[PDB]
Structures are given as C-alpha cells and as structure tokens.
Design a binder for this molecule. Structure first.
Ligand code: ATP
Ligand code: MG
Lengths: 50, 41, 221, 241, 57, 50, 118, 121, 100, 121
C-alpha cells in the first residue's frame, strides 16, 4: 500500500480483503488512493506478475 | 452612582467553632526525655 | 444485506495455479458514526473481511496521520503478506508500540521509572513519529524497510522526537542519491542480509554526523 | 437517545481517571522507597547526638529553660505537620483529629494553643475555622531538608524561650513497619529528665571542653532540631504510603 | 621568592593546560557544528529554488 | 602545557579541515538536488502538455 | 590506629581508619592519636578536620556545626554540613567568607581552611 | 482546501498546531474536572493555559451579533489570523489573562482589551 | 428562543431556575428599553463564561487575580438574579439592579 | 466442573492454589514492568519465580507439533498433573532454570530436561 503503518502492522496480501473503517474525514479515501498510486512502479515494470 | 455610594456608606453586613472533641488521653501524648544515668529518682 | 456484502466480498480471491494464479484484492470502505463499530453494517463487514484498519478522529487531531489505531487494527493473513526484510524489521514493532501505550501515563515521571521503562518510552515516541506519512506520498517497500530499520534498530534514539520525520526524509533522500545499492538489492533479494545491514549502519552513522537537529544539538550517539 | 452518549462520555472519563490513579500509585510506591531511604539515612546522627546528650547530662546542671517545666503554664505552641498535595487519604484528616484532641487536652489544663502549621492542607483546615496561625511553612512536605527543620525548630524555640509559649508540641504522622501510618502528638519542650540507671559501674571519666554545662546548652536546641527533622521525615514517608 | 613563583607557575601551568585541553574538544565541536549548520543552510536553499522552479515551470 | 597547546592547535586545524571536507559534500549534494529538481521540471511540464 | 566516623544530619560523611585526627574545638586546637581519654567538645564555627592515614594523603573536611566525641571506640564527629577538600571551589568559598551573614561567613572560612588558604 | 498546496505551509501548520492543542485540552478536561489542574505536568499546564487562550481567541464579535451584545463587529485578515495564532501557539501571550481574548478582533483589539485589564502584549 | 428551567438549579436555590448557558432570546436587545440594553449588554455571555470558569476552577489550588475577580463578580451576579415567586420588579428597578 | 464433587478434593485444591499464585503474579506484573523486579520484596520475588515456573509448565509438547519438530506429543494423566503442580506449588523446582519447563510432559520429562541444563530434582 505504500503506507508504513499498514505495510508494517496490518499487511495486505494479493487476494485478501482489508476493510478500511472510520468515522468521517479520518483518511480512508486517502489510504485507498495512496494504495492505488503505489502500483505505479509495478505497472512501469511491464511484468504481468507484478 | 452617587446614591449607591452614599447608601454603601450606611450599609451593615451580617471565632473558632467548638468541634466537640474529647480530650486526648495524657498517656498517649509522648514526652521527649533526656535519659540521664545518675541515681536520683 | 449480509448476503449482499458477503456475496460481493467473497469474489475477491487468490486463484490456484491451475486457474491461472490471478488475484483480486478488496479494500472495502465503511464509515461509522461516533466510532460505533457495533452497528449493523460495520459488524457485517468486519465479520466478512480478513482484516481491519480502524481510523480515529482523535488520532487524526493529535497529528497521527494516517490515523490508524495500530492497537486494534489487525490482518489475519499477517506475516504471510510481507517480504522477509519487512517481516524482520517490523517484528519488534507491535510489542514496542503496545509497551509505549501502556507507559504513556508515566511520561512526566521518567526519573521515577526503570531505565528499561524510560528506554521503552523514548523508543515508542520515536516509533509513533516514524509511522507518520504525508498524503499522496506512498513509499516503495525497500524505503519502508530502511525506515523501520532506522526505528527499531535504535538509530533514532539519539534524534529528537520532533526531528524524526525530517531525519528519515533526509536519510532516504541521501540513500536514493548516494547509496542506491542497498535499496536495489533489498528490492531484488526481498531480504536484508548482514552485509546490507552493515553498510546501512555505516551510512546512517555518516548521515548522523552530517545531520543537524532543530535544537542545534548533534544526533551523534 | 443522548443517554448512551453521556454514558460513553462518563466511561471514557472514568478510564482517564483510572489510568491517572494507577500511575500515581506506582509513582507513590517508588517515592515511598526513596523516603524510607532518607529516614534510615538520617537515623545515625540522631542516635549519636542522643548518646552525646546523655553523656553531657550525666555531669551537667539540669536547669536549662528547655529542661524545667514552668509553673503558670499559659500557652503551648503546637506544630501541625500536614502535606502540601492532596491525593492522600485520611492522612491530613487524621492529623487534624489528633491536633483537635491535643487542643482539647490543652484547654483542659488552662493552656492556650498557639498554632504553627507545616503544609497547605493544615493552612486550609485552620483558616476555614478562623484559627490564628502564627507561622506557616510550605513546599517541603514530600522532601524535607534539615534546613527547613532548623528554621522551624529555631522559630519554635525562640517562641518558647520568650509572644511566648510555655510548652511545645508536634502533631505528625509516625511511620512504622510500612504498615502503620499513625498520627501522634509529641511534647518536645520542656523535656523531662529521666534517670535510667548507673548501668556500667565505675568507668573512665569523660573530659569536657570547656565544661559539661556549656556543651549541654549548645546541644539542647540541636537535639530539638534533630527531633523536628526526624518528625518531618517520618511524616513524609507516611504521606507517601 | 623564585622557588615560590616556580611552584605557583607550575600550578597555573597545569590548570591552564587542562583548560586548553578541554577547549580543544570545545572549539572542535564548535567549528564542526558551525560547518554542519552551514551545510544544512545549503540543501534547503537548493530545495527552496527547486520548489520555486518546479512551480513556475 | 606544551603538549596541550600543540594538541589544541592540531585539533583546531583538523577541525577546520573537516569543516571544509563536510561543506564540500554539502555543496555537492546541493547541486545534485537542484539537478533532480530541474529534472522533475520537464516531466511535470510534459505531464500537463500531454 | 583509631576509627573515624564523621556523620552529618542526613548522611555519613566519612568513615575509616586513621593515625591522627587534627581539629579545633571551641577551647583550642586538638589532635587525637589512637588511644586517647574520652572527651566531648564542640568544634569552632569555621572548623576543618584533617585526617591522616598511613599510606594515603591527608583528608581535609570543612565541617559546619560539628561536635567531637572521643571514646574507646574512636572519634565520632557530628556535623550539620561537611565538604571534602576536593569538592570545594575556592571562588565561592572566598566570596562567601566576606559575607555579612555570620554562619555563612563561617562556612566560607571553613571551606577556605579546607582548600588550603588561610 | 485546508491543504499545504492551497493555503500554504504556515497556514496549514498553524491550523494543525491549534487543532492538536485543542485536542489535548479536550483529552485533559476530565482529569481537570475530577483531579484538578494541579495533578498535571508542567507541559500539560502550559498546554491547558494556551488552549484556553486559543479557544477564547477563536471567538469573535460578529457584525450580525451586535443586536445581541451591543458591541460592533470586527473583520480580521487571514494573515493577521495566522500570525496571531502562531504567536498563541508558541506562547507569546501566556501572561495575558484568559479574558481579553474573548469576543475581540485581531492583535490590536487584543492589546487594547489586555491593557483595559492591566496587561501588556 | 427558550428559557430552560432545571431542577438541579432550582434545588440549589437559583430561582428562577433558568440555565443561562443554554437559554437565549433570538430577538435580543431589540426587545429591551435602551437603559436595560445598555446595562445588561453582555450579561448572558458573562454568566456563561462565569459558569464555565466555576466548573473549570472547582479544584484549583490557586488562581490569578483576574480569574478570582471573575468568580466573585459572577457569584454576586448569580445571587442578584434570584427572585421570589409573584414578586415582580418594574423595568427601572431592574435597570438599577443590573447597574448595581 | 472444576468442583470438589466432580474432580475430587486434591484436584480442586491444587488447581485453586495454582490459580491463586498466577493471579498474584498477574497483580505484581505491572509493578515489575514499570518499576523493576529489583524493587520487589523477597517473598514477592520468590512467588514471581515460582509463578513463572508454573506458567511455563502449563505449556506442553503437542501432537500437532510432531510435523515440524519430529518428537511425539505428551499425554499426561490427571494424577501426574495434580502431583506435578502440587510439587511446583510447594517449591520443589525453584532451583531449576526456567527453560527446563518449556514444552514438556509430566515429571519424567521435566527431570530429563532439567539434567540436560545441569539441574537435579
Ligand atoms: N496521511 C495524511 N496526512 C495529512 N493529511 C491527510 C492524510 N490523509 C488524509 N488527510 C486529509 O484529511 C482530509 C480528509 O481525508 P479523506 O477525505 O481522505 O477522508 P475520508 O475517509 O474520505 O472522509 P470522507 O469520505 O468523509 O470525506 C483530506 O482533506 C486530506 O487532506
Ligand atoms: Mg472519502
């Protein structure tokens, strides 16, 4: 995900479901958008496995 | 304001309580002593 | 409605190698009201998913951003979803943070604490400052490994709490510019061997003797 | 509605209070250890000055003002030793009960209590009751030094020798066995001459420079101060317990 | 007089020697922290005008 | 005292030399950072042109 | 040899074995050797106790509010305050000796005796 | 738009520090209610004083509220707001009473109401 | 606007039992004569801030001069607004009392 | 069914003694964590040692672990467990190192594991 808190404490694997749950204006969309943005290097690698 | 101060000139507003505690027992009031060794009781 | 959400979230799967080996990872989002995770739909989706990241408004207002409650957040997959370097540098992180949370009441009584307890207090403060991150700025895994290494190895015990973010930023900048071999072979080998750790310690010491704290002091041990 | 909100609010309030009180209890434990250390550290000088005072009184003129009781006892200066902080239990309340027992003993004998206080809690208790506090000392209840005890003892002995008091008492919490914090009243002046026995038979003669009476009258207020300091240390350890 | 002046000069020499000894590390750290604060003056002005040119471009 | 004085002047001159050696790497990484920023400039421009 | 025990109101200043203890009581200077008649005395305001051991060098302790007691056990010195020789800074010990407060000037003079001056 | 890219670094940093101080004050309010201001740290007491002054300086005499208090309203520019709250957060007004921050405008009104109370900015 | 009466304030002796912090009039000073509008200018905000300070300083060991002055003035103002039942005051006497 | 009429008198007494010791250790754990084991009393330290020993002897080598390690799992009878924990509550093993209690079976395994670290009954 690119977030140190998640990747270190609550790691998400390929095929897993990690609920993001919070009140409002707590940063849920930010977490998910950062996760999406973190795949930019994977896409640049061109490898369908990555 | 003048009237109020002239009135405060003549205004009149409205010791230790007993606590009704009974005396300490003299046997329990310790006394600092000087332990002399001379014989003179 | 439980069926409505479980039917949807059970289609996120990791397929077998006979089916191609593809995968779909789901990140469902649930908004709670007044931090009530015992409401109906929150309860359902907590029951369905494999792990939860709980985000608090109080933690957000205290400066902890992302506002993740690391105490109650959980991943049931766990270390099976980490590379070995991250699995190794972050294994001593959860117990450290729990000890810091237990000891937070004794912040103004360091002299009244065991030396180990004051050490745990300072380490926990550094680790809480280390898990902060700006918005829209994700880090590759090798840099997160280097950052959590800075944290849990002890190389932040000499940096002021209010300088940990800047120290980590500038050290990662230095390593991206100067020592690209450490990051490159962490990324390639997925582990942090002893020679990589040694070179990392050397680079950290040189940077520390180069780094300038905000209080004018030195971060050199 | 809005009842569950107030209930959750009270729950988090009580949780904060619980954390704070648990931390305060562990801090108090550590500081009890410290205060017991200070007490057993001050013990030896007390023992040695007591022994030297005994040796001097063996061959002195026992007519010092601090040593003879006065006919016409009109006033007793009482020193109440309380705390500055308030998260203790019935510590101050027990001190005040003992002090009221002492005051009602002193009014039975015709003496007028003159009140000196140590601590802010006694200040509050006695100003609320419209008392007359001759002197107050504050800020050294949890770690008293010998200089505070010296100041207190000098003021008390000056009041005794002189607008003048005929007796001197101390109401403080004695600390014993780590399990007994007991408010006690002691009489520090005038001291009472008590004869134990010849003990050892014929022994060597002690030389006194210049003589025994000078050294005795120089040691008497020092002994008062040592006892005031021991009382302060015992009260500090008792307050922490 | 000469011998007393000699012993006094020896005492003063020891004291001044130890003082200069301490001042050695003192001024060494002073110079290197002046140097590192000068260094930290750079790498931010560079970041400053880098941010300025990135935004103006 | 002779040894202490010579050690003081030696440490002083080494301190100044080390100050120079350090500001060297300082200005070097400064020009490198400026270069990285100018490099980001063209790609951030093209990302908007396109 | 004699056993010296210098104790203060809240701490044991020093304790050990000596061959000669020099001090100054309110009647004059005095020096105690291993065997010595029992004695009780009061030291001067600006008192300095110099202790001499076999192999070591003389300890020199400024004592403030002292009382000397020689017995069969040895020497015992009660103090309100005490400061060893190698713990005094002669600047404050000198500008305190000039003070107008009697007991603080006495303390300064004791520290000055202990450092070596006066 | 409370974002460093929109409002600036100083605006954002001052807002975040104000919010953090107010959050810490909210966390300490229960202890202060039950145990008192005395059982807090020196840092916590400093923060509580700063937070009371901050929460009073956030109030303002509004133009549409003159019908309720009789006092006319005030307009404060955003740069003055940011600079004043940066000073409050650093602690430059820890000697001014809690009042004189209440229903005022900028720093000039702060000075005037502080001196009308016997204080100086 | 609303005048919120409380049984806790009633039992304490505050009568009328108006909770000054949550009570308000949306018409405001337009519903007063000029004398009352000028003497009772910020009286409601003053009493609200006084109740806040009295709740905050419930266990304060020491308080500075401004806080103690606020507490004294607020206690006097609270005692001044108490009133018996069926005992009205003309508006000029109310103006005089608020001026006091 | 931890009741004297179901399991017996000695079973119940041993279980209750174990539970008492473990609860007292739980109470002391926070004093140990914040202050240190050096601050505790003498009976306190003795109970801490005995309770760590009982904690570790509650562990076992499970039959689900034969896949990794390769050594079979223990099936300790009730009588042997009652007797072993009675002895552990008395203190017959306070000289044995802690590691001698990790993942073993009854008392024979305890003895053979202890003498492997240089400790007898
Ligand atoms: N890691 C972060 N650091 C700093 N600011 C952040 C961070 N994450 C989010 N924010 C800020 O918090 C604000 C709200 O976050 P966000 O909109 O992502 O929350 P949300 O869960 O989508 O809430 P909602 O759906 O109610 O808007 C945003 O303006 C964003 O700038
Ligand atoms: Mg959103």
């Amino acid at each position: 995900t690119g977030i140190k808190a998640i990747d270190a404490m609550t790691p998400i694997g390929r095929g897993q479901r990690q609920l993001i749950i919070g009140d409002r204006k707590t940063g849920k969309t930010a977490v998910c958008v950062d996760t999406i943005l973190n795949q930019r290097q994977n896409w640049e690698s061109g490898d369908p496995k990555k | 304001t003048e009237v109020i101060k002239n009135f405060k000139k003549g205004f009149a507003a409205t010791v230790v309580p007993d606590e009704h505690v009974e005396a300490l027992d003299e046997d329990k009031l310790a006394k600092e002593a000087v332990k002399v060794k001379k014989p003179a009781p | 409605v439980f069926y409505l959400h479980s039917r949807l979230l059970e289609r996120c799967a990791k397929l077998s190698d006979d089916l191609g080996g593809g995968s779909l990872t789901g990140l469902p989002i649930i908004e709670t009201k007044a931090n009530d995770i015992s409401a109906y739909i929150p309860t359902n989706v907590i029951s369905i998913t494999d792990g939860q990241c709980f985000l608090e408004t109080d933690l957000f207002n205290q400066g902890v951003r992302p506002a993740i409650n690391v105490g109650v957040s959980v991943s049931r997959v766990g270390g099976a979803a980490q590379i070995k370097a991250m699995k190794e540098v972050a294994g001593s992180l959860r117990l450290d943070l729990s000890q810091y949370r237990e000891l937070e009441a004794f912040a103004a009584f360091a002299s009244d604490l065991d030396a180990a307890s004051k050490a745990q207090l300072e380490r926990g403060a550094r680790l809480v400052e280390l898990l902060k991150q700006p918005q829209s700025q994700p880090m590759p895994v090798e840099e997160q490994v280097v950052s959590i290494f800075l944290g849990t190895g002890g190389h932040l015990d000499s940096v002021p709490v209010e300088d940990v973010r800047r120290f980590e930023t500038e050290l990662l900048d230095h390593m991206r510019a100067s020592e690209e071999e450490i990051l490159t072979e962490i990324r390639d080998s997925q582990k942090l061997t002893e020679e990589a750790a040694d070179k990392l310690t050397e680079v950290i010491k040189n940077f520390k003797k180069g780094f300038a704290a905000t209080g004018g002091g030195s971060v050199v041990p | 509605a809005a009842t569950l909100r107030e209930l959750r609010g009270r729950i988090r309030s009580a949780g904060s209070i619980k954390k704070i009180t648990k931390a305060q209890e562990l801090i108090a434990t550590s500081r009890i250890a410290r205060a017991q250390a200070r007490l057993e550290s001050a013990r030896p000088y007390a023992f040695e000055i007591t022994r030297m005072l005994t040796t001097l009184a063996a061959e002195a003129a026992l007519d010092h003002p601090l040593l003879v009781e006065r006919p016409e006892p009109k006033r007793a200066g009482v020193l109440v030793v309380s705390s500055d902080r308030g998260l203790c239990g019935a510590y101050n309340a027990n001190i005040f009960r003992r002090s009221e027992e002492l005051f009602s003993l002193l009014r039975e004998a015709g003496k007028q209590p003159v009140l000196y206080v140590v601590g802010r809690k006694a200040q509050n208790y006695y100003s609320f009751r419209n008392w007359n506090i001759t002197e107050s000392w504050m800020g050294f209840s949890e770690q008293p030094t010998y200089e505070n005890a010296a100041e207190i003892a000098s003021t008390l002995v000056d009041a005794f020798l002189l607008e003048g008091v005929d007796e001197l008492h101390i109401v403080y919490t004695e600390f014993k066995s780590m399990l007994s914090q007991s408010a006690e009243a002691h009489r520090i002046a005038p001291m009472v001459v008590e004869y134990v026995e010849e003990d050892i038979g014929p022994r060597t003669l002690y030389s006194f420079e210049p003589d025994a009476t000078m050294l005795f009258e120089s040691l008497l207020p020092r002994y008062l101060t040592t006892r005031v300091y021991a009382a302060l240390l015992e009260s500090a350890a008792s307050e922490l317990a | 007089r000469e011998r007393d002046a000699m012993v006094a000069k020896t005492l003063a020499d020891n004291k001044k020697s130890d003082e200069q000894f301490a001042a050695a590390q003192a001024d060494y750290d002073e110079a290197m922290t002046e140097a590192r604060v000068q260094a930290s003056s750079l790498r931010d002005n560079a970041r400053a005008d880098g941010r300025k040119v990135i935004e103006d471009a | 005292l002779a040894e202490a004085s010579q050690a003081h002047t030696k440490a002083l001159e080494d301190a100044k030399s080390e100050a120079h050696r350090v500001v060297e790497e300082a200005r070097t990484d400064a020009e490198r950072i400026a270069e990285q920023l100018e490099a980001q400039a063209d790609v951030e421009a093209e990302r908007i042109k396109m | 040899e004699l056993n010296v025990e210098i104790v203060a109101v809240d701490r044991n200043i020093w304790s050990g074995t000596a061959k000669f203890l020099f001090t100054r009581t309110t009647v004059g200077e005095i020096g105690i050797l291993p065997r010595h008649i029992p004695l009780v005395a009061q030291l001067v305001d600006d008192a300095m106790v110099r202790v001499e051991r076999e192999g070591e060098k003389d300890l020199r302790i400024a004592v403030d509010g002292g009382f000397l007691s020689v017995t069969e056990e040895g020497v015992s010195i009660l103090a309100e305050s005490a400061e060893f020789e190698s713990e005094i800074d002669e600047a404050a010990a000198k500008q305190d000796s000039e003070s107008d407060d009697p007991r603080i000037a006495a303390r300064g003079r004791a520290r000055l005796r202990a450092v070596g001056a006066i | 738009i409370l974002d460093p890219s929109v409002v600036g670094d100083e605006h954002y940093r001052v807002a975040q520090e104000v919010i953090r101080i107010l959050q810490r004050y909210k966390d300490l309010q229960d202890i202060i209610a039950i145990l008192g201001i005395d059982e807090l740290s020196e840092e916590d007491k400093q923060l509580v004083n700063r937070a009371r002054r901050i929460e009073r300086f956030l109030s303002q005499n509004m133009m549409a509220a003159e019908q309720f208090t009789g006092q006319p309203g005030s307009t404060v520019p955003v740069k003055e707001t940011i600079e004043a709250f940066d000073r409050l957060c650093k602690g430059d007004f820890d000697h001014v009473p809690e009042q004189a921050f209440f229903l005022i405008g900028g720093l000039d009104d702060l000075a005037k109401k502080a001196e009308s109370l016997g204080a100086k900015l």
